[PDB]
Structure 1
Amino acid sequence: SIVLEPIYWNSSNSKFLPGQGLVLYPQIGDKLDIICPKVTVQYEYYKVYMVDKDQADRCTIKENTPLLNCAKPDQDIKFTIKFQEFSPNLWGLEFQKNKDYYIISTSNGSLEGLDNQEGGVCQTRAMKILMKVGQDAS
């Protein structure tokens, strides 16, 4: 229960259906792990943010802070999201049933373009995650 099965943020992840990213239907109480594993020893540099539908579609980024600053190739980077309406923590994310939340990255994937604010990996590999909190799948 609750533990939702980690979601490796890495182009090789088949779950990122190219052109439509990966869609999820997490419910309240559900826990989720976005992971950026190490290396083996080619590492994909990313700066993962959570954004509104606007920025989600037509991949652009803007005070818009990374949940994952995948830039440490020797160790694992990870953000465990807790799908709760009311957060026991003040600096902790909160959700609401029947709302969508989007997580994208506009990085080239390479260290070179880790700060790209436009398109990037998202636009290409379609590394976006749409979470339809408390909703089924048509």
Structure 2
Amino acid sequence: SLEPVYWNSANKRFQAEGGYVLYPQIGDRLDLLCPRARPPGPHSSPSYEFYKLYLVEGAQGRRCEAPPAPNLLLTCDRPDLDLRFTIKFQEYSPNLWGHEFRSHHDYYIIATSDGTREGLESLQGGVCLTRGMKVLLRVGQ
């Protein structure tokens, strides 16, 4: 099925060949995690890396560029706490914006921050370029 996506440099699934591509099925869940990295357990990185993850149109995903008023999924503010976000590929959601997942379309989960507290609000390719931190999502027809 689908595995948790850990959002730090320590992942390395990012520095992979094709480039972190998930093919979720309609009905699939997905977790994006920002693990403690304060009392440093497994899966955490050298030091806490401050990120904002956006879901992006794929076209913009390639260009490593969030649009204005982007679709912010998760905000790794807290180096003290484990953070998570879960999607289900379904018609219902506690989301109130009315976003929708075209099938046969490409979406990216990107982080345009340089990974620093001062670079957090950056809306244009940061670690998305630097460490190649994006994930393509191709959702079952």
Q: Same fold (TM over 0.5)?
A: yes
SS in 2 for 1:123: helix
2:115 counterpart (109, 113, 120): 109
Aligned to 2:27: 29
- Cα displacement (A) at 1:98: 2.8
Change (3 A) 1:73 1:37: same
TM-score w.r.t. the length of structure 2 is 0.82
1:46 is the counterpart of 2:44:
no
Q: Write the letter of the residue equivalent to 2:121.
A: D
Find runs of 4+ consecutive structure 1 residues off by over 4 angstroms. none
Q: For 1:56-71, list aligned pairs within 5 A.
A: 56-61=61-66, 62-71=68-77
Identify unmatched segments of 5+ residues in structure 1.
none
- Cα displacement (A) at 1:18: 5.2
TM-score w.r.t. the length of structure 1 is 0.83
CA contact (8 A) 1:19 1:125 kept: no
- CA distance, structure 2, for counterparts of residue 80 and residue 96 of structure 1: 19
- Cα displacement (A) at 1:33: 0.3
Identify unmatched segments of 5+ residues in structure 2.
41-46
- Cα displacement (A) at 1:19: 7.6
1:77 is the counterpart of 2:83:
yes
- Cα displacement (A) at 1:99: 2.5
For the aligned residues, what is the CA RMSD?
2.2
Between the two proteins, the alignment pairs up a number of residues equal to 132
CA contact (8 A) 1:35 1:78 kept: yes
